[PDB]
Amino acid sequence: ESYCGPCPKNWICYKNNCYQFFDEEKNWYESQASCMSQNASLLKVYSKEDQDLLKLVKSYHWMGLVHSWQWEDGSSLSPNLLTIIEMQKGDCALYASSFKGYIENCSTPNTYICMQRTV
Amino acid sequence: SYCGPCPKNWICYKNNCYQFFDEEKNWYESQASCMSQNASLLKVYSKEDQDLLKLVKSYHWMGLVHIGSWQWEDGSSLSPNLLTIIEMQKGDCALYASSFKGYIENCSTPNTYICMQR
Numbered sequence: 001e002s003y004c005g006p007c008p009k010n011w012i013c014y015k016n017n018c019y020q021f022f023d024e025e026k027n028w029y030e031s032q033a034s035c036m037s038q039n040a041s042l043l044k045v046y047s048k049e050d051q052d053l054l055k056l057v058k059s060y061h062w063m064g065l066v067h068s069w070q071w072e073d074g075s076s077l078s079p080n081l082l083t084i085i086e087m088q089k090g091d092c093a094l095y096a097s098s099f100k101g102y103i104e105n106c107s108t109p110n111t112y113i114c115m116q117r118t119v
Numbered sequence: 120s121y122c123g124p125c126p127k128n129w130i131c132y133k134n135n136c137y138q139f140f141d142e143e144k145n146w147y148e149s150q151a152s153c154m155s156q157n158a159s160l161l162k163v164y165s166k167e168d169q170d171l172l173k174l175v176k177s178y179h180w181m182g183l184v185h186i187g188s189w190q191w192e193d194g195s196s197l198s199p200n201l202l203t204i205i206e207m208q209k210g211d212c213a214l215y216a217s218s219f220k221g222y223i224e225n226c227s228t229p230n231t232y233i234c235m236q237r
């Protein structure tokens with residue numbers, strides 16, 4: 001038993017991370033700017049256990065992974081977290097279940113997931 | 120602010136706790152499963168407080184049953200203007216589907232289910 005947060009009211013909270021799904025399709029850069037305007041970043045995958053809700057996410061959504069692969073915050077992609085699969089020539093990646101990243105053209109519009117860490 | 124309290128591995132949203140269960144069970148077995156977790160099946164009371172339900176994919180048991188109207192496990196009645204009820208099978212139980220639909224279903228049919236706690 002626990003509390004979850006802190007998060008803004010309109011975000012899903014799970015294991016002290018805040019998540020928000022955006023259905024208006026945008027390219028990777030526009031998606032990044034949208035999350036930033038909400039004091040957040042695109043989804044960062046750092047723990048299969050602490051982010052196991054991602055097993056339930058269907059369809060395909062921008063996350064903050066760019067091409068080695070690294071996150072927006074400049075940190076590296078830890079091994080054993082995502083299976084990166086070629087799909088379209090590009091330097092950005094879409095999250096899909098379960099813990100997959102599909103390589104995609106950064107200019108192609110897609111739905112996206114923003115995330116705020118609380119620590 | 121903070122959301123909860125909830126059990127550690129449940130989703131929290133606007134102070135309600137939600138858990139999806141992938142093992143298919145009939146309505147009665149699903150009700151017993153949620154009760155074992157000191158919870159109940161999903162109750163829908165507000166499209167605003169529960170707008171995350173717009174994002175739910177597929178069909179899942181909720182706590183709505185027919186006896187002279189539809190009622191939740193807790194005995195309260197279905198509020199008007201909350202769910203569109205759709206009938207394509209003979210039954211006395213209902214599956215939730217987005218967006219704010221209830222599909223009448225045979226209580227004996229195995230389905231995935233959503234538990235909720237508050």
Ligand SMILES: CN(C)C(=O)[C@@H](NC(=O)c1cc(-c2ccnn2C)ccc1-c1ccc(C(F)(F)F)cc1)c1cccc(C(F)(F)F)c1
Nearest residue numbers: 012021056057058059130137138139171174175176177233
């Ligand atoms: C992109 N989005 C939005 C998805 O993918 C959504 N996924 C499913 O709703 C979803 C898909 C499945 C599933 C397995 C195989 N096919 N499908 C559709 C099986 C179950 C669910 C599910 C059911 C109930 C709940 C609930 F009620 F406990 F919360 C949460 C998920 C989604 C992912 C993560 C969180 C949410 C939510 F609801 F919290 F906002 C929704």
